Write a protein that holds these residues in place. Sequence first.
Motif, PDB file in Angstrom:
ATOM      1  N   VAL A 116     -21.139  -8.864  34.601  1.00 21.62           N
ATOM      2  CA  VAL A 116     -20.458  -9.418  35.795  1.00 21.62           C
ATOM      3  C   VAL A 116     -19.741 -10.760  35.542  1.00 21.62           C
ATOM      4  O   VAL A 116     -19.700 -11.648  36.387  1.00 21.62           O
ATOM      5  CB  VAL A 116     -21.417  -9.458  37.014  1.00 21.62           C
ATOM      6  N   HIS A 117     -19.163 -10.929  34.354  1.00 24.21           N
ATOM      7  CA  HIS A 117     -18.312 -12.062  33.956  1.00 24.21           C
ATOM      8  C   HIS A 117     -17.116 -11.642  33.083  1.00 24.21           C
ATOM      9  O   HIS A 117     -16.268 -12.478  32.777  1.00 24.21           O
ATOM     10  CB  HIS A 117     -19.172 -13.149  33.290  1.00 24.21           C
ATOM     11  N   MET A 118     -17.024 -10.356  32.710  1.00 24.15           N
ATOM     12  CA  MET A 118     -16.069  -9.838  31.718  1.00 24.15           C
ATOM     13  C   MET A 118     -15.018  -8.860  32.250  1.00 24.15           C
ATOM     14  O   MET A 118     -14.068  -8.570  31.529  1.00 24.15           O
ATOM     15  CB  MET A 118     -16.850  -9.114  30.610  1.00 24.15           C
ATOM     16  N   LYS A 119     -15.157  -8.294  33.456  1.00 21.92           N
ATOM     17  CA  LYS A 119     -14.314  -7.153  33.879  1.00 21.92           C
ATOM     18  C   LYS A 119     -12.820  -7.500  33.918  1.00 21.92           C
ATOM     19  O   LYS A 119     -11.984  -6.650  33.629  1.00 21.92           O
ATOM     20  CB  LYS A 119     -14.793  -6.581  35.224  1.00 21.92           C
ATOM     21  N   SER A 120     -12.475  -8.761  34.176  1.00 25.31           N
ATOM     22  CA  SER A 120     -11.086  -9.222  34.078  1.00 25.31           C
ATOM     23  C   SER A 120     -10.465  -9.092  32.677  1.00 25.31           C
ATOM     24  O   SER A 120      -9.245  -9.023  32.558  1.00 25.31           O
ATOM     25  CB  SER A 120     -11.005 -10.686  34.486  1.00 25.31           C
TER      26      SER A 120
END
Lengths: 52, 151, 151
Positions: free
Chosen positions: C59-63
């Motif tokens: 929940v910190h990487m999807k971008s």
Amino acid sequence: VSVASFVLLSMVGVAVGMCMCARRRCITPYELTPGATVPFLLSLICCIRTAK
Amino acid sequence: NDCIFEVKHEGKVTGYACLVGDKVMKPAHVKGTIDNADLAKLAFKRSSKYDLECAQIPVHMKSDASKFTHEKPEGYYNWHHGAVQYSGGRFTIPTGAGKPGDSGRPIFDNKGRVVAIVLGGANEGARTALSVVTWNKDIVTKITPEGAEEW
Amino acid sequence: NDCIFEVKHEGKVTGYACLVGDKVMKPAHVKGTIDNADLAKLAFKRSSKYDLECAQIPVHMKSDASKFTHEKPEGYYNWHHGAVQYSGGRFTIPTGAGKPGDSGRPIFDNKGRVVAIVLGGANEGARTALSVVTWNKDIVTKITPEGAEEW
């Protein structure tokens, strides 16, 4: 006769409780949506409208 | 191009109601009504799955409603903090655009009509995806990124 | 165009993992994980019928995830060792491009989105063809030409 007539009266109350819950879980998207209309068949089933 | 079609609610920074199609509609997770005289009188529906409150537009406001569509081609759209990209089936904006209390805002088609309402956002990398509601094929549904925050 | 969505695993000749769509995805026939701090924490599903290992994104990487599609016309596609040609249902390359340790690398559509991941190479004279994985009809499959060697 008193306990029976009370539980049966509460159970037809719980059955009428579908209008309090089931009707809203089916119908609320058709109340929320902009400019859309509910299908005529469903309109009779939920007693909701004369037309739209 | 015009962006004025919201009305605010409460004497607080807590979001807005949109005048769309046949109805006023608003985010349900926020409170305090009377920043317009029609929010004071309108009888509202609500539903817990989608976080809308909805009411039919009053007889004096009928002419002023914003137009809308269910259509969502890939690419770029507009909202009050500027350009927003809809791709991979999700809306996205640069992080720090949008905030808590910037909610109930429309997303506009470049042809000048609404396609979604904003409810919140995620922070899973610094190009925030949005929690939104939209009316795919003439029924409302909610889209919610994993771990998104209600605004 | 950029390969920068790849993340390596181990201080060895062994390979990389790809940040794609909603997931990290990796080749299963190779090992060692912790050149990168998200490969250390994630729990992986696996299948020796497709040779994937995959985990849903942290929940910190999807971008930072690369875009993807199932669409695969006849023609030319891109990877780290330059141009790669999809024809007759095979992916194919100039002979002597690719090597052991260059499995787990994505193949890109010319519009800058992933269409397959490399596993290994078959060779017949000056003809070279890839074992790869891809998501035709929305569900993973493996392609494997005769005598292919894993990388």
